[PDB]
Design a protein around this ligand. Structure first.
Ligand SMILES: *[C@@H]1O[C@H](CO[C@@H]2O[C@@H](C)[C@@H](O)[C@@H](O)[C@@H]2O)[C@@H](O[C@@H]2O[C@H](CO)[C@@H](O)[C@H](O)[C@H]2NC(C)=O)[C@H](O)[C@H]1NC(C)=O
Ligand SMILES: *[C@@H]1O[C@H](CO)[C@@H](O[C@@H]2O[C@H](CO)[C@@H](O)[C@H](O)[C@H]2NC(C)=O)[C@H](O)[C@H]1NC(C)=O
Ligand SMILES: *[C@@H]1O[C@H](CO)[C@@H](O[C@@H]2O[C@H](CO)[C@@H](O)[C@H](O)[C@H]2NC(C)=O)[C@H](O)[C@H]1NC(C)=O
Ligand SMILES: *[C@@H]1O[C@H](CO)[C@@H](O[C@@H]2O[C@H](CO)[C@@H](O)[C@H](O)[C@H]2NC(C)=O)[C@H](O)[C@H]1NC(C)=O
Ligand SMILES: *[C@@H]1O[C@H](CO)[C@@H](O[C@@H]2O[C@H](CO)[C@@H](O)[C@H](O)[C@H]2NC(C)=O)[C@H](O)[C@H]1NC(C)=O
Ligand SMILES: *[C@@H]1O[C@H](CO)[C@@H](O[C@@H]2O[C@H](CO)[C@@H](O)[C@H](O)[C@H]2NC(C)=O)[C@H](O)[C@H]1NC(C)=O
Ligand SMILES: *[C@@H]1O[C@H](CO)[C@@H](O[C@@H]2O[C@H](CO)[C@@H](O)[C@H](O)[C@H]2NC(C)=O)[C@H](O)[C@H]1NC(C)=O
Ligand SMILES: *[C@@H]1O[C@H](CO)[C@@H](O[C@@H]2O[C@H](CO)[C@@H](O)[C@H](O)[C@H]2NC(C)=O)[C@H](O)[C@H]1NC(C)=O
Ligand SMILES: *[C@@H]1O[C@H](CO)[C@@H](O[C@@H]2O[C@H](CO)[C@@H](O)[C@H](O)[C@H]2NC(C)=O)[C@H](O)[C@H]1NC(C)=O
Ligand code: NAG
Ligand code: NAG
Ligand code: NAG
Ligand code: NAG
Ligand code: NAG
Lengths: 202, 147, 318, 413, 49
């Protein structure tokens, strides 16, 4: 299915405090009112393009992670991200991923040079200059506004062209290079944005 | 040119050409702005010549303090000088004054002047120089009754 | 501070900047020339009166009510009430080496001068402008203002209550307008905005590369070998100098266009306030009677009182 | 300084902005995190058993902060060569990844551990590349790797069919054939087992004694760094003009308190001018404001030199508590700036020399440069009343002289 | 059209002219001010009535 993203998908572009100010930044952003793909247990492989917006609306935490790469098999190194029942876990390896990757936490059936270990859930994934950069927020696809904070950056340098989720026995959009005008309040949180290319008033 | 071969003397001279061109275009611009200032003092000097010298000006404090009688121009290097002769009121005296005089039910106002009392007797006098005159039917005009 | 805007703390840059010679002296001396003229403008406009006339407490101005226009002792700057409206309605050092010199005449002193020009005007008419101040009852100098336009002075006296009530009402229309609307003082606000916007350009230009490998000169000092470092700095200073020269030049142009407005305001002071102007539409639409100056922020507001004919009746004439 | 900057031996009365002054940095502060992952060099240098050089060990060093000064400043190393890198600047450089290699060899064999070397160790045990980026660190180990009767734990490859490629390893034990006679898997004439063990008795000469070696190989690549040298730090100071470096953000300014609440991921703070307004201390996690060290034009206030050589000085903008302590005793704070040498008085006069914000200065009484709030003019009560008029009895004929510019020197360049 | 005058059609030049930053925004805005001033002048002189 398909749905309107409205003004979703803004994220803090740099690790800099700014307050009571309007700032113009040019970066890969989800275009405003973009038509984002919408999903409900098929878990297809999807292209990554230049960068991904991912979100889900859940009350049971059925979605559990993602896998990223090109071949998505042991012919290349690939990235695994999994929110297991006790930790967020991240690994880079030549995973021979399963034809139908899923968890069940009795069952693990998803399939090395990097590892790390740590409602509407929103995420943005970038892979630029060899950094896989993750942004997220958890919110109590609805029309509205909030900005995703940086979760983690992985200096892994790998090549990615397509990805797939992990499910336990969601919405996808893609970033484009856009100029955004961002509004910072006195507490230095982003409170509004203008996608400069949206319309002549913008 | 005495010290370096052409192929790199060009590179050194290109720096002097850029710097000396930038130096000169900065001077030219500031002269265009100064010229736009002197032009406004030449337009004002021409205007004061037409209006203070060739004429008499009622423009207050244009042709000097006081009431302008006449002015005489004098030249000076890169400029002009105006000698503004002006009448200035001096040694003012207090008088009691009234807007109108009443007699026989008629309100009288001054033609050209103002009414003043010397403390005992009423006169009309001109505004700018104390010159008392008897109040008469030929130096006042009637309008309306005394109410 | 031209050396500080261009090079900052870098001695390495300062040893290059000396090769450009006296550009930083010009850029300093031009801006100091603009700075001095701002004081000349404010003196030429306001300091036209050499004796500070106190306002008389009697306030028997023939029924005219200048309470909006005369000073208010309850305010620390002792501004008038309309001067306080104007002051509020014009709404608004650093690492970059900018500094914002204060004016010579404080906002109080220019408000004392307007109060002197105004208290002279209502108590003595034109006479204080061109000699010693000669007191005259306001009803009578108004009749001189009427007689000057060629309306016989009896038309003042016989209608003095109506004339006073019209004027007093019209002062209310000013106060309500300058309170309620935003758009009147745009002519001052534009000059405030242009100066602020000119600095916001000048400072953001420090983030430009101009072809250098970094816009932050401290990077080059830490990260390049001396010859390449100095070449990359020469790239930056060539751009920052030409950024600062573009600012100074447009401040010279603005200062000349403000000088032309200071000269006009000084002439409206001399001819509308210190006098009565026969010059059509110079001192406002209608026939001029008198004008009152009010010291808006870095500006002046003239309240031109004017006589306007009404209720035109046809007649046959020969 | 006026005579110099005006380039004249005579000066007319006025205020001259002869130069600018700045508060100088008192010291340099550095700040970086005090909790970090130190690189585990200890377990490669101080392992109980090292590798046999034919089977030389490798360990990846990554995602860590090094301090190679701990190594290079130690006296126990007998040899500390570096190639493409200097042992000192090694501690300033940073790398994507590092590989630590270690083995035991004879003392005579250390000279083979260099780029472009040849011989049994270089050719058949451990080969360095022609453009090797790393350092070779070696020390005598006859205190550890030898014993009475000899220690034969360690081995080296004595025979191979061909030379190793750089960083190649070969642990194969197939009997080497040195001639036309087939070996059929047994030793004999022209038929030799490819490895030999060192004669490490402790009494041997130094060339025959065992040496331990660690070789550090540095991956300088376009990939992101993961092994930097030490993120040093100083003590922290506030309310003083200092140079600063916070996580590489480097400048000069007054560090001071803040109440601006950064978000937990944020490190730097900027104003509306793309310029550093605040920074997080990476150790205390406090937020500091940064303010520029105060500066201003310094202006010399003088009567004409025909009148006096005494002068006052105005430091534009800055506060008198900050002005550097050149010899004047009198100090006064105008709203235009700190004024020195000039004497405040309670009189008022016409503005002789303007300073700013209503203050003017003049050479007056035994003379001194007084500083005063300017007189607007004489103060007058205008004697209005509802029935009085004043009329001049007399008149003055003024002549007022006015002067206007008209032209300027016609020029062409 | 400042970038059209300097760089013409070329993106490869435009990406360099952006390193000179605000310079083309100054020139576009200065000329815009002069252009509006021409309407102001003519309204001021003629539309008095
Ligand atoms: C003109 O007279 C005034 C005084 O007021 C007038 O004269 C009174 C006798 C009385 O008739 C009043 O109703 C009049 O209005 C003089 O003003 C005073 O001057 C003195 C100095 O001599 C000064 O101390 C007072 O403050 C002044 N009064 C006010 C109200 O300011 C004035 O000097 C006389 N002028 C001339 C030229 O004679
Ligand atoms: C990453 O590697 C993949 C292949 O492993 C590259 O993807 C191919 O790109 C070509 C076009 O250049 C396409 O025709 C193929 O269909 C792609 N294959 C897959 C599996 O995606 C990709 O170009 C590489 N990316 C980078 C940045 O080098
Ligand atoms: C989630 O993943 C973490 C690792 O990222 C698991 O933690 C490990 O658990 C095993 C025991 O099963 C330990 O031996 C390891 O030492 C643990 N590693 C770390 C880094 O703590 C964790 O058990 C996983 N949770 C579930 C429910 O599978
Ligand atoms: C910014 O943060 C401050 C606290 O850091 C918030 O201030 C509080 O606001 C509530 C009302 O919303 C008051 O009841 C509290 O008393 C305030 N605290 C203080 C210390 O002032 C403020 O609301 C936040 N604003 C935004 C826009 O996020
Ligand atoms: C006011 O002016 C009148 C003149 O119009 C003065 O009255 C005259 O006084 C002289 C003597 O000083 C007599 O010879 C005249 O006959 C008087 N004329 C009239 C019409 O009475 C009067 O004295 C003046 N008052 C003051 C106070 O000076
Ligand atoms: C002059 O006009 C003003 C109004 O424009 C008068 O001020 C008001 O006076 C009344 C009392 O008479 C107060 O209740 C109001 O609050 C005043 N207005 C304001 C805005 O404060 C003033 O009294 C008038 N004076 C004369 C002499 O007529
Ligand atoms: C001249 O015009 C004024 C108004 O500008 C008239 O004054 C008003 O007259 C009406 C009654 O006709 C009153 O209700 C108003 O209060 C008056 N205004 C004021 C301020 O007092 C005046 O009557 C007109 N005169 C003639 C002869 O038409
Ligand atoms: C000049 O500097 C001193 C500090 O050396 C200023 O004193 C402080 O003033 C503020 C108010 O502006 C107070 O809150 C502080 O408590 C004062 N500090 C001390 C130590 O007393 C002084 O105000 C400055 N004056 C000017 C005119 O700038
Ligand atoms: C008006 O002022 C003038 C001076 O400006 C007076 O003329 C002088 O009068 C005195 C005697 O009072 C003579 O000694 C002088 O020689 C006169 N000056 C000249 C140039 O001749 C004049 O008397 C004054 N008149 C009045 C009425 O006050
Ligand atoms: C979104 O895009 C898909 C094709 O990518 C299209 O089929 C669908 O109709 C679009 N939906 C909307 C609401 O535009
Ligand atoms: C090995 O141990 C010594 C102390 O026994 C220590 O000083 C040294 O630092 C250790 N090696 C390394 C590489 O740290
Ligand atoms: C790190 O340093 C700061 C002071 O600079 C101190 O407050 C903090 O406790 C230190 N952290 C640890 C773990 O010691
Ligand atoms: C002051 O100027 C006069 C001009 O006549 C000159 O004679 C005198 O020597 C000068 N004095 C000083 C101290 O410069
Ligand atoms: C001068 O003014 C100061 C206040 O600035 C005051 O403290 C002092 O007493 C005054 N002295 C005289 C003699 O008026």
């Amino acid at each position: 299915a398909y749905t309107n993203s409205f003004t979703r998908g803004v994220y803090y572009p740099d690790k800099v405090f700014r307050s009571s100010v309007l700032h113009s930044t040019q970066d890969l952003f989800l275009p405003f009112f973009s038509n984002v793909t919408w999903f409900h247990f098929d878990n297809p492989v999807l292209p990554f393009n230049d960068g991904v917006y991912f979100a889900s609306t859940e009350k049971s935490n059925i979605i559990r992670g993602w896998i990223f790469g090109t071949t998505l098999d042991s012919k290349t190194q690939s990235l695994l991200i999994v929110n297991n029942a006790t930790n967020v876990v991240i690994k880079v390896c030549e995973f021979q991923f399963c034809n139908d990757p899923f968890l069940g936490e009795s069952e693990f059936r998803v399939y090395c040079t990097f590892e790390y270990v740590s409602n509407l859930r929103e995420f943005v994934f970038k892979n630029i200059d060899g950094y896989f950069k993750i942004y997220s927020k958890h919110t109590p696809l609805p029309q509205g506004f909030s900005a995703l904070e940086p979760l983690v950056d992985l200096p892994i340098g790998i090549n990615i062209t397509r990805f797939q989720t992990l499910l336990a026995l969601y919405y996808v959009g893609y970033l484009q290079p856009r100029t955004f005008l961002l509004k910072y309040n006195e507490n230095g949180t982003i409170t509004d944005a203008v996608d400069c290319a949206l319309d002549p008033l913008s | 040119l005495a010290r370096l071969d052409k192929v790199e003397a060009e590179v050194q001279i290109d720096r002097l050409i850029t710097g000396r061109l930038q130096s000169l275009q900065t001077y030219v611009t500031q002269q265009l702005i100064r010229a736009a200032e002197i032009r406004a003092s030449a337009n004002l000097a021409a205007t004061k010549m037409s209006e203070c010298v060739l004429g008499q000006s009622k423009r207050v404090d244009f042709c000097g303090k006081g009431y302008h009688l006449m002015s005489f121009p004098q030249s000076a290097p890169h400029g002009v000088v105006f000698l503004h002769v002006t009448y200035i009121p001096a040694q003012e005296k207090n008088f009691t004054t009234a807007p109108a005089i009443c007699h026989d039910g008629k309100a009288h106002f001054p033609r050209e002047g103002v009414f003043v009392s010397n403390g005992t007797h009423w006169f009309v006098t001109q505004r700018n120089f104390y010159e008392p005159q008897i109040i008469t039917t030929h130096n006042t005009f009637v309008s309306g009754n005394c109410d | 501070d031209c050396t500080m805007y261009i090079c900052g703390d870098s001695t390495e840059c300062s040893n290059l900047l000396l090769q450009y010679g006296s550009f930083c002296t010009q850029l300093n001396r031009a801006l100091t020339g603009i700075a001095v003229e701002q004081d000349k403008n404010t003196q030429e406009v306001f300091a036209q009166v050499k004796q500070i006339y106190k306002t008389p407490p009697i306030k028997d101005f023939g029924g005219f009510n200048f309470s909006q226009i005369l000073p208010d002792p309850s305010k620390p700057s002792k501004r008038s009430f309309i001067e306080d409206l104007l002051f509020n309605k014009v709404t608004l050092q650093k690492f970059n080496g900018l500094t914002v010199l204060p004016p010579l005449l404080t906002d109080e002193m220019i408000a004392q001068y307007t109060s002197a020009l105004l208290a002279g005007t209502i108590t003595s008419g034109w006479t204080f402008g061109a000699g010693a101040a000669l007191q005259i009852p306001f009803a009578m100098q108004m009749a001189y203002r009427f007689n000057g336009i060629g309306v016989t002075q009896n038309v003042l006296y016989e209608n003095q209550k109506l004339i006073a009530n019209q004027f007093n009402s019209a002062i209310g229309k000013i106060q309500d307008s300058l309170s309620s609307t935003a758009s009147a003082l745009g002519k001052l606000q534009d000059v405030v905005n242009q100066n602020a916007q000119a600095l916001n350009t000048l400072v953001k230009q420090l983030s430009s590369n101009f072809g250098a490998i970094s816009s932050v000169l401290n990077d080059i000092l830490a990260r390049l070998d001396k010859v390449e470092a100095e070449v990359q700095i020469d790239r930056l200073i060539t751009g920052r100098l030409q950024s600062l020269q573009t600012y100074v030049t447009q401040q010279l142009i603005r200062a000349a266009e403000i000088r032309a407005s200071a000269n006009l305001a000084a002439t409206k002071m001399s001819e509308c306030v210190l006098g009565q102007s026969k010059r059509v539409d110079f001192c406002g639409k209608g026939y001029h009677l008198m004008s009152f100056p009010q010291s808006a922020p870095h500006g002046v507001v003239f309240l031109h009182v004017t006589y306007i004919p009404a209720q035109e009746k046809n007649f046959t004439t020969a | 300084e006026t005579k110099c900057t005006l380039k004249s031996f005579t000066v007319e009365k006025g205020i001259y902005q002869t130069s600018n002054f700045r508060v100088q940095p008192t010291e340099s502060i550095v700040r970086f995190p005090n909790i970090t992952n130190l690189c585990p060099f200890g377990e490669v240098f101080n392992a109980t058993r090292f590798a046999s050089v034919y089977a030389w060990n490798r360990k990846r060093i990554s995602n860590c902060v090094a301090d190679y000064s701990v190594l290079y400043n130690s006296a126990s190393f007998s040899t500390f060569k570096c190639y493409g890198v200097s042992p000192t600047k090694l501690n300033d450089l940073c790398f994507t990844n590092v590989y630590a290699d270690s083995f035991v060899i004879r003392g005579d064999e250390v000279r083979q551990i260099a780029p472009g070397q040849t011989g049994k160790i270089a050719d058949y045990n451990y080969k360095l590349p022609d453009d090797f980026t790393g350092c070779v660190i070696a020390w005598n180990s006859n205190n550890l790797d030898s014993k009475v009767g000899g220690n034969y734990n360690y081995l080296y490859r004595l025979f191979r069919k061909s030379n190793l490629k750089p960083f190649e390893r070969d642990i194969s034990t197939e009997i080497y054939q040195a001639g036309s006679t087939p070996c059929n898997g047994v030793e004999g004439f022209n038929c030799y087992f490819p490895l030999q063990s060192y004669g490490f008795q402790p009494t041997y000469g130094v060339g025959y004694q065992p040496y331990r070696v660690v070789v550090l190989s540095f991956e300088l690549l376009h990939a992101p760094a993961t092994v930097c040298g030490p993120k040093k730090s100083t003590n922290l100071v506030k309310n003083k003009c200092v140079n600063f470096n916070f996580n590489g953000l480097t400048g000069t300014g007054v560090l001071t308190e803040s109440n601006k609440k950064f978000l937990p991921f944020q490190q730097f703070g900027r104003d509306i001018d793309d310029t550093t307004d605040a920074v997080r201390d990476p150790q205390t996690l406090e937020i500091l404001d940064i303010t520029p060290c105060s500066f201003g034009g310094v202006s010399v206030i003088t009567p004409g030199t025909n009148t006096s050589n005494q002068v006052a000085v105005l430091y534009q903008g800055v506060n008198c508590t900050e002005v550097p302590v050149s010899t004047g005793s009198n100090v006064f704070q105008t709203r235009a700036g700190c004024l020195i040498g000039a004497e405040h008085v309670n009189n008022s006069y016409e503005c002789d020399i303007p300073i700013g914000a209503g203050i003017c200065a003049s050479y007056q009484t035994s003379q001194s440069i007084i500083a005063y709030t300017m007189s607007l003019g004489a103060e007058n009560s205008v004697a209005y009343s509802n029935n009085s008029i004043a009329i001049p009895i007399n008149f003055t004929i003024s002549v007022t002289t006015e002067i206007l510019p008209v032209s300027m020197t016609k020029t062409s360049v």
